[PDB]
Design a protein around this ligand. Structure first.
Ligand SMILES: [Cl-]
Ligand SMILES: [Cl-]
Lengths: 213, 213
């Protein structure tokens, strides 16, 4: 889409115009944003589940619809296959959505039990309107790529358990790298543009881009 | 990428030179070839496992290495990250490969449906015959795409459980469609080039190509 091309433009921008370096940029930031902390791929039966930094649980179903359980664990936002948003308590759900609500609770409680948080990025205070949802995702043999409505871009790698997140804060683009020890380092794209980067963050930046294209 | 580019050349070939139609080409061929009957994605822990029509079980590990278990469940083929082939029994496996061997058996035993008496149990001829393996795969919210050693090309869709397989038996290109009700129909690409096809098989061919690109 237009969102995907925008992120890919700036990611490529920073990539072939950045110096060669020894280490990751020393200028790092202490802010919190929205990102995927836990994820679950059950696409062969139901769909793709993810948990956000504010503890929102979402499901991108195979039929195309979105379902989100809010941090209060009571309220459900449901966007259908064409985009009609319905908001209703999860406890008493219309009998059209019960099947989907059940699966949504199932994802929400698989993640908390079996799965572990992926980074020490500070839990976020929540609100932006409209609310974030996953517009598309794709998986290769090397990495998991997720792109959201608001343009936040995340790629998870399997073996290293390393991650890259590209977000928009105020007027800047941020790149956050999450290393082998689940630890957050956040840069500005501008600073990474002029100051270069490490060998293994640049390899991961190169790969994240190939997934977008 | 040479393999992918070959399939993409002829598939785009047939796609941009085919009429628009209402129905499927009637001139069909009846043969069977090698394709994936079972697949299992555990990429964040092990890798991607698959079972072939000839009862070979393969694992594409996240690191890029391939490991194949022969139909007899006795012999292990190990192709290294770019193609160094190692062959050894699973019972007697070099202790360099165990971690990888164990995982291959784990997939092999997931592949195992519940055991039901019956015959004939699959058996191997040559203990050293280079069987095709997965070169790379990609998954979207709609489909799984797999590209193999010999250039065999397969796209599985989730909700429909519908499949497309592009093969080269020689040295012509075949497209096999396996529809919503489990029925295989195999055409020649030349036939699909000149006569067009159904509305959404053309839509499924279009999606398969976009996944390659
Ligand atoms: Cl068209
Ligand atoms: Cl397990």
């Amino acid at each position: 889409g237009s969102v995907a091309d925008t992120v890919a433009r700036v990611l490529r921008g920073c990539l072939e115009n950045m110096p060669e370096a020894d280490c990751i940029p020393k200028e790092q930031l202490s802010t919190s944003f929205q990102w995927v902390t836990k994820w679950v791929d059950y696409s062969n039966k139901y769909g793709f589940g993810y948990q956000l930094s504010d503890h929102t649980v979402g499901v991108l179903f195979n039929n195309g619809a979105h379902m989100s359980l809010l941090p209060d664990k009571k309220t459900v936002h449901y966007y259908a296959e064409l985009g009609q948003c319905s908001v209703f308590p999860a406890t008493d759900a219309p009998e059209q959505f019960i099947s989907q609500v059940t699966v949504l609770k199932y994802f929400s409680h698989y993640m908390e039990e079996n799965l572990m948080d992926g980074g020490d990025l500070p839990s976020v205070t929540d609100i932006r309107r409209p609310r974030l949802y996953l517009l598309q995702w794709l998986k290769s043999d090397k990495a998991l790529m997720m792109l959201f409505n608001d343009g936040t871009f995340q790629v998870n790698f399997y073996h290293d358990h390393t991650k890259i997140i590209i977000c928009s804060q105020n007027e800047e683009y941020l790149l956050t790298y999450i290393n082998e020890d689940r630890i957050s380092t956040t840069f500005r794209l501008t600073t990474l543009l002029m100051s270069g980067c490490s060998s293994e963050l640049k390899n991961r930046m190169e790969y994240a881009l190939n997934m977008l294209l």
